[PDB]
Design a binder for this molecule. Structure first.
Ligand code: HEM
Ligand SMILES: CC1(C)[C@H]2CC(=O)[C@]1(C)C[C@H]2O
Ligand SMILES: [K+]
Length: 405
């Protein structure tokens, strides 16, 4: 239901958008969010859903807010408030100056030098999974590739057993698209419960895995504490288990529905890096926010200290004012503008791993399975949250049109 309208919010700014169950979700989750950018809607609106919060609907305001960390703090970055308050991951729950020291440590496990390290294991696993699917002429892409590929890469990088994936995937699901079986705080508690003994073991007997690197690392000189290491590893788990996993399904659903864009990439494989970028814009999928540190007049709207503001990273690139014809996918876009990996001091540290996983998937899938479609009669359902997603993606192809390499 709807929270009572606070006294300082004018009535002409009310627009009751539900980020966990938007009205037009049946048309596609990105399209459902894009109703916030129709001609009747102001640049900054208030929704009474999920406890009541502001929403910035346009790339210009979203970028400005993410840059101004003095007014828009990441101390409480999730809606609803009880989730944002419980949220204490590092570095995301910190503002500069304190935040920055932890980014260098995190960069040690997912930074560009490390991604070049994993280059061939990433390639090897993608090829292995796709060739296993190729003769079947069908798959459930979410379960058969979108989950195993990024998650098994992350679990190897973190030195965690693959048998733990269903448990951990359940918990990160509850932090991003809750089904109501757990609050965010309970899921976060359960994630830390998993991590605490592992952190302890790898500070006594350190190794070469990402948890060992974070847990034995230094933070601008001084040792990291066990608690900080846990709060960093929690974040890396969510990123490894929820981001590329869900993005790959949006991308493959689009290609399965658009033979012309497929053929363009088969005909012209060197455009695949650019296509990755244009797909990251069109099927952007993260939406978090900030909390006001003081009363502040922002673009002619009076924001109050403690107000939460959703700053949908998803919406910047779908904004017609940043990209003409924003809902159309054009691999030859001159200037692809988006904030899919965030903006400001919290720019995604995993984005280099993410791009490699996406580009390797596209190259290696189209090589072996150039021609595929949605299974006949299937209605693809999307789900909305902090990270939006695809419920299921049944694909079909003629094994005779395929190639083993
Ligand atoms: C398509 C894939 C991905 C997308 C769209 C994405 C998106 C984002 C966004 C929007 C933020 C900024 C959050 C904010 O400002 O509140 C972020 C931060 C971050 N992401 Fe990613 N992410 C992706 C993949 C990953 C992966 C695979 C990892 C692996 C560990 C990762 C690690 C991080 C970290 C550590 C931060 C925090 C940086 C900081 O707070 O200083 N990301 N991501
Ligand atoms: C918003 C995020 C997607 C981003 C920062 C978070 O807390 C995430 C949920 C995981 C990481 O990639
Ligand atoms: K918090």
């Amino acid at each position: 239901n709807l929270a009572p309208l606070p006294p300082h919010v004018p009535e002409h700014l009310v627009f009751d958008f539900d980020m966990y169950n938007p009205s037009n979700l049946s048309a596609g989750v990105q399209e459902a969010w894009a109703v916030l950018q129709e001609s009747n809607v102001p640049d900054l609106v208030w929704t009474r859903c999920n406890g009541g919060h502001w929403i910035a609907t346009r790339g210009q305001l979203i970028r400005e807010a993410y840059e101004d960390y003095r007014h828009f703090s990441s101390e409480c970055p999730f809606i609803p408030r009880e989730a944002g308050e419980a949220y204490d991951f590092i570095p995301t729950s910190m503002d500069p100056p304190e935040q920055r020291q932890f980014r260098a440590l995190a960069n040690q496990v997912v930074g560009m030098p490390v991604v070049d390290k994993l280059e061939n294991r990433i390639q090897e696993l993608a090829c292995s999974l796709i060739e296993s699917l190729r003769p079947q002429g069908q798959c459930n892409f979410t379960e058969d590739y979108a989950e195993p590929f990024p998650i098994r890469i992350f679990m190897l990088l973190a030195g965690l057993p693959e048998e733990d994936i269903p448990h951990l995937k359940y918990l990160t699901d509850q932090m991003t698209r809750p089904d109501g079986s757990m609050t965010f705080a309970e899921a976060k508690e359960a994630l830390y419960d998993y991590l605490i003994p592992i952190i302890e073991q790898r500070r006594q007997k350190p190794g070469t895995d990402a948890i060992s690197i974070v847990a034995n690392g230094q933070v601008n000189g001084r040792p990291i504490t066990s608690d900080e290491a846990k709060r960093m590893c929690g974040l890396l788990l969510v990123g490894g288990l929820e981001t590329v996993v869900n993005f790959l399904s949006f991308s493959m659903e689009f290609l399965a529905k658009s033979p012309e864009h497929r053929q363009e990439l088969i005909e012209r494989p060197e455009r695949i890096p650019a296509a990755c970028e244009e797909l990251l814009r069109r099927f952007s999928l993260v939406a978090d926010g900030r909390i006001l540190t003081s009363d502040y007049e922002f673009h002619g709207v009076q924001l109050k200290k403690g107000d939460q503001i959703l700053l949908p990273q998803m919406l910047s690139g779908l904004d017609e004012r940043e990209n003409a014809c924003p809902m159309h996918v054009d691999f030859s876009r001159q200037k692809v503008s988006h904030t899919t990996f965030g903006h400001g001091s919290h720019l995604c540290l995993g984005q280099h791993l993410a791009r490699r996983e996406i580009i390797v998937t596209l190259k290696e899938w189209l090589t072996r399975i150039p021609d595929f479609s949605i299974a006949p009669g299937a209605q693809i359902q999307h789900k909305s949250g902090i990270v939006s997603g695809v419920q299921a993606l049944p694909l079909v192809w003629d094994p005779a049109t395929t190639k083993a390499v």
